[PDB]
Amino acid sequence: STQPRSKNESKEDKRARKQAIKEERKERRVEKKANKLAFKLEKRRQEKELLNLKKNVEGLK
Amino acid sequence: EETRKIPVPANRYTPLKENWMKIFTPIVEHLGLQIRFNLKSRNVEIRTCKETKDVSALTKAADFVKAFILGFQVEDALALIRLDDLFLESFEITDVKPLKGDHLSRAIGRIAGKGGKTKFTIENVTRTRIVLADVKVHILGSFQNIKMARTAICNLILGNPPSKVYGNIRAVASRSAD
């Protein structure tokens, strides 16, 4: 939420907004870790595939 | 009558005393204003008299005295006294970027170079005069020249290498119809 804070807001208004921003912060960190894991698995599999290409299937006859 | 007094630092009191005759000669000859050195106040006071030819000569004399006290060369001060469009643009080193300690000193090197070669090249290219005091850089020249000098000095003071900075300054000088 890109809502500029004014001077007139009181408690249970700023608190809820900060807790909300905290919530999507924690969530966004969760899918950041998930994407790190997915790209890690994909890179490990593609490295195994490339090294397999080095080991087998490269030639003419 | 009115007078203008310029304070004199102790770090340049002997340089001003050595060049006292060469400063007081054009001040009383070409402008015709009384000049005194209040040793108690350590201030150079220039006052008008009945021998004053015209207005704004006292302002030019004050500008020349400020240029001499700041650390600029005597010929540069005389040229600023003779010419009309001359300004003393000064900027603190820490205004360009937040720099503290040894890195700040190294940044001075990035304005100076080995021997002052970068400063001399910038002075020749931009047609300005640059004095690098301990945390300050004072530039004297034309308004467009002062703008080009400020841009080049800020670029060198922001980490950029001196070769690329010199090339950019040469490009700006060629693009300014110098």
Binding site: - | P7, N11, R42
Partner: protein, 213 residues
């Protein structure tokens, strides 16, 4: 279209009886237009006056903030508000190798005027001092500062505004401090730096009557 300066007026502002030069000048004031009185409108103004514009023989690096209070038929009775040093002078004072001592006091005078007074002092290089450094140790600095507060209080708290203003024009306080600090560490140049105005008594006339004449 209509020139606002035609509705204006030029009131006179004078220095008090303390200073040799009397007329400190002219003020542009919008005239009374029924609702708001011009006298009340100009009652809360400050004036920055140099000491060489008040006394001929004195120095030029002191400035005075002064409040006017009363209107006397295109005449303004002005009271002393505070004093400060010239910024060019302050930039001239701070040398590289020289310890600076600052102090402030909050002194209520005998006539009810509560002031926040400031004092700056620089250390003195000696006549045969080969050593470029002239640093004062911190306990000597604290002792100098404590003597500075006690001396400034002892020549301000015992007096009204008249004697304190009379003392600060030649800086008798500064000469007294520089005389008294030669026992601890010989000091170079001490002045009362800034005079702030903390608390003003109730406004009336007779004090201003004797203050102007």
């Amino acid at each position: 279209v209509v020139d606002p300066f035609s509705k204006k007026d030029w009131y006179d502002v004078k220095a008090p009886a303390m200073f040799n030069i009397r007329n400190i000048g002219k003020t542009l004031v919008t005239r009374t237009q029924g609702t708001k009185i011009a006298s009340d409108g100009l009652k809360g103004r400050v004036f920055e006056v140099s000491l060489a514009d008040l006394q001929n023989d004195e120095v030029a690096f002191r400035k005075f903030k002064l409040i006017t209070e009363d209107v006397q038929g295109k005449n303004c009775l002005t009271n002393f508000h505070g004093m400060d040093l010239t910024r060019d002078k302050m930039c001239s004072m701070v040398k590289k190798w020289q310890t600076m001592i600052e102090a402030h006091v909050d002194v209520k005078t005998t006539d009810g005027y509560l002031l926040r007074l400031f004092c700056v002092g620089f250390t003195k290089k000696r006549n045969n001092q080969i050593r470029k450094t002239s640093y004062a140790q911190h306990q000597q600095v604290r002792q100098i500062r404590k003597k500075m507060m006690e001396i400034m209080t002892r020549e301000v708290q015992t007096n009204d505004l008249k004697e304190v203003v009379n003392k600060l024009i030649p800086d008798s306080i500064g000469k007294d401090i520089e005389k008294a600090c030669q026992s601890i560490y010989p000091l170079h140049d001490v002045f009362v730096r800034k005079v702030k105005m903390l608390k003003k008594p109730k406004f009336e006339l007779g004090k201003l009557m004797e203050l102007h004449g």
